[PDB]
Amino acid sequence: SDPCPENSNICEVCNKWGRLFCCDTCPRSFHEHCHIPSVEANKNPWSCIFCRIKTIQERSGHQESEVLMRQMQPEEQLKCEFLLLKVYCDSKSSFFASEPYYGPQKPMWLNKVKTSLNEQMYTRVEGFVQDMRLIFHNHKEFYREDKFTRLGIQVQDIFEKNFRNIFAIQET
């Protein structure tokens, strides 16, 4: 019988079936590795990244310099993890997930930022934002085809908008 009848039958990120982990405060479901951070399979009750972000947000304009200067404390760590997950939640991001096909000065892809952020290889937010922006830099450097160029432009705008919304950065 369905262990979690009030929870999704497909992942929130890739929108696919399989072995799903179910949140205990909202009806979302995530693959073991599609969630960020990777699901702590033995934590009860387990809350997903959207509920933890809600908890932080309602109980916590800024300048981009100051945001980037922040050390990766658990709040900032969880915000960056959520921003990268929001990037994963778009289909176009699948183009930048695996290690690419060509040679740039420093290649970078989504899964490697997932790995480094998982192992807490970033001491400040600027490291994560800098690897994410380095993906788009290298894409604008090596690919000229119109379809994939537009694709990387769109994914870039998605990352930057989610970046300024989550860390509450000021316009103007």
Binding site: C4, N9, W17, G18, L20, N42, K43
Partner: peptide
């Protein structure tokens, strides 16, 4: 954390 098993034809 609770788990379940879903499938496209299920």
């Amino acid at each position: 954390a609770r788990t379940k098993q879903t499938a496209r034809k299920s």
